[PDB]
Write a protein that binds this ligand. Structure first.
Ligand code: N92
Length: 327
């Protein structure tokens, strides 16, 4: 069946230890070197704190991992090891445990994040190009390392808008890509789930992340965040189909032999494919260009195999102004 157009065999070409995360044995340092200063957030798998390393005064973030099999912990740790030094990937400083309870935690570099809801209403055209280019560097890097992030969304994209620093965080849903492998579709935030997930197509690849990135680009240039605002996973696909079109959805399903859950029959309706220019109005016109729309059109495609790769996206004319500034 389906495979990635890029980096398809890269894990098969590496040593097994690279991708056999169940066999990984982390070295767990001592969490007692860190003083927790403030809670930043919590989710189903972790709680995150700002902290200080008392031995060297470094400000960090500590992600204390909630009870889960050690398998998911080893996965995230091994992925982060493999991504060491990757451009715009959050830096893992250490893997530590409370030395009595043995509860594990991950220590990351600090980023002075600007809350994205505030940020995404004040970005300039050049800012959007710049930050999308920076995020693409992280995705091209992880994809080249054989890893799908599977949870790309604004929260997971820390941006320090003063220092112009971007980091892709929270690798707890990330997996290794292996050709023909069937993956769990219960990944990503609703609003950033690709159509493949919503139609229960398990043989997905790095291109899932490119759908999510496209959703972010749409939200930035159009100032509608999130761009596709489903009420549940079923409605999420309806929201997509009202833009990309229903006949076009059916062509995708037919190509990949995808079985459609019959609950969709009652809710998808009939929708023409919309022109991306339909989303332009006076509040967003200064962020939208022909180049932006061309790029977006090539990301927000049903057919995962037809989406741009991260590299192809980086190579698009939309980013020429950014490349020129960075050269
Ligand atoms: O899972 C992960 O790998 C993970 C990694 C890092 C991380 N860092 C965060 N930084 C903040 C923050 C917000 C506002 C200010 Cl002012 C400063 C920091 C929020 S979250 C969170 C993580 O969940």
């Amino acid at each position: 069946g389906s495979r990635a157009r890029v980096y398809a065999e890269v894990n098969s070409l590496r040593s097994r230890e690279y991708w056999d995360y169940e066999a990984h044995v982390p070295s767990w340092g001592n969490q007692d070197d860190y003083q927790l200063v403030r809670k930043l957030g919590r989710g189903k798998y972790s709680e995150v704190f700002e902290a200080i390393n008392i031995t060297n005064n470094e400000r960090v973030v500590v992600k204390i991992l909630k009870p889960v099999k050690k398998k998911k912990i080893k996965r995230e740790v091994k992925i982060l090891e493999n991504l060491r030094g990757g451009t715009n990937i959050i830096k893992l400083i250490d893997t530590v445990k409370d030395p009595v309870s043995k509860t594990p935690a991950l220590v990351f570099e600090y980023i002075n994040n600007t809350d994205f809801k505030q940020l995404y209403q004040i970005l300039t055209d050049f800012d959007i190009r710049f930050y999308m280019y920076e995020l693409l560097k992280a995705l091209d890097y992880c994809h080249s390392k054989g890893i799908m992030h599977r949870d790309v969304k604004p929260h997971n994209v820390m941006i320090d808008h003063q220092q112009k620093k971007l980091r892709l965080i929270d690798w707890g849903l990330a997996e290794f890509y292996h050709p023909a492998q069937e993956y769990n579709v219960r990944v990503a935030s609703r609003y950033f789930k690709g159509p493949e997930l919503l139609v229960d197509y398990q043989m997905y690849d790095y291109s899932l992340d490119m759908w999510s990135l496209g959703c972010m680009l749409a939200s930035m240039i159009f100032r509608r965040e999130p761009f596709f605002h489903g009420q549940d996973n079923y409605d999420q696909l309806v929201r997509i189909a009202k833009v990309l079109g229903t006949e076009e959805l059916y062509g995708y399903l037919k190509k990949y032999h995808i079985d459609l859950d019959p609950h969709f029959n009652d809710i998808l309706g009939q929708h023409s494919r919309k022109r991306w220019e339909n989303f332009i109005h006076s509040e967003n016109r200064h962020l939208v260009s022909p180049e932006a729309l061309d790029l977006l059109d090539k990301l927000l495609r049903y057919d995962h195999q037809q989406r741009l790769t991260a590299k192809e996206a980086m190579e698009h004319p939309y980013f020429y102004p950014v490349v020129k500034e960075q050269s």
